[PDB]
Symmetry: C2
């Protein structure tokens, strides 16, 4: 039926689980929505400039920076808590039912994440959904972050798959744009506070769902339309 | 003395001048600090993926996306207002005096911006500081955004300058990283809500100042050291 390659953070696992840490350190949980794009921005800046550090290290550095920008104190305990929380986000309730449907419809399922590999158990193992997936890939061997073409190309290579056989699924349009630029299909799943960017001359996702159930409806529909 | 290449948006011209638009549309001026890194993020994503649209088009698209993410109503008049404010940010009052002293000290002054070439009057002309600079350069000729190496290399080639003759000045460490990766020097100017990122093997700025006056002093003093 094709191979569905899922983004992990925010797409499958719930980033708002970090909210309490932002509430405590900044007095405002909404600082999550400043820190996260800053983290992605710097991941892309390192990639454009030929530099690489593991995603969690960038996450901690950007947390310190945003703290400094707010004049908020950060302790080693805070940084350790950021690491623990970022590697233990729970799956959204809609994920396991959608993956069950997609597997039963014949799709092969893979993950692809900016996060560096961890010892077992991985965040997806902890969250109880790792067993849906036949492969768990990361940007770490590429030493480049999404949406660099190397990330998607090395993924297709590892899977022995052609771009026509692949669909990138994410709640970040920058990740779907990344994969579609390499000839893959793209599927966008809305998560709270994640809606698609629309811009002229930038390809739209092939599939768009307001949640994972709705995205799976569209994917399954496309098998026989 | 060397050639000082200035970032325009936020570095020379005051981004907080947009806060009232964010206050009105979102009920919270702090959404500026969500929207701005998302704008930079997406500029880098288009660059990584081989796509180019003018920076202002991305600004409007990201504004509409952030609005959708907050479930906030946005009208064509709001988008018009964004254009008005973004293209007319006033110069910080420390700017003209600092540029004056750098000129006195024999530095050549240039601007380099992600913003597309503007019809007259430009943001710098409106702000009354355009005439300090011998050249006003943009990412147009590179069709790629900062910190892509082509932007700096095309700028050096345009100026007939060697990397060792150039210093990129910005309040965004992503811009100084970009330039230093191409062998330029970097000078960081603190602006409210901007502090350097400290990350292993990421180059730190050669010069730092808490405002443009103090940075100018550092640059000027380095000629006698």
């Amino acid at each position: 039926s094709g191979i569905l390659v899922f983004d992990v953070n925010e797409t499958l696992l719930d980033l708002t689980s970090l909210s309490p840490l932002f509430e405590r350190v900044f007095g405002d949980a909404k600082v999550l929505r400043e820190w996260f794009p800053e983290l992605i921005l710097y991941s892309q800046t390192l990639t454009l400039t030929g530099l690489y550090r593991p995603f969690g290290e960038i996450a901690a550095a950007v947390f310190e920076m945003v703290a400094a920008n707010h004049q908020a104190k950060v302790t080693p305990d805070d940084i350790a808590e950021l690491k623990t929380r970022l590697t233990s986000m729970p799956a959204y309730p809609d994920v396991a039912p959608a993956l069950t449907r997609l597997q039963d419809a014949g799709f092969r399922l893979v993950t692809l994440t900016n996060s560096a590999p961890s010892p077992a158990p991985s965040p997806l193992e902890k969250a109880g959904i790792a067993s849906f997936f036949e492969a768990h890939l990361t940007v770490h061997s590429s030493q480049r972050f999404k949406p660099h073409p190397s990330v998607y190309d090395s993924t297709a290579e590892t899977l022995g798959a052609k771009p026509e056989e692949l669909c990138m699924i994410a709640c970040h349009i920058w990740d779907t744009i990344g994969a579609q630029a390499r000839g893959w299909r793209g599927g966008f799943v809305a998560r709270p506070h994640n809606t698609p960017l629309t811009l002229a001359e930038v390809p739209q996702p092939d599939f768009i769902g307001r949640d994972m159930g709705e995205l799976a409806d569209q994917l399954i529909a496309s098998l026989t339309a």
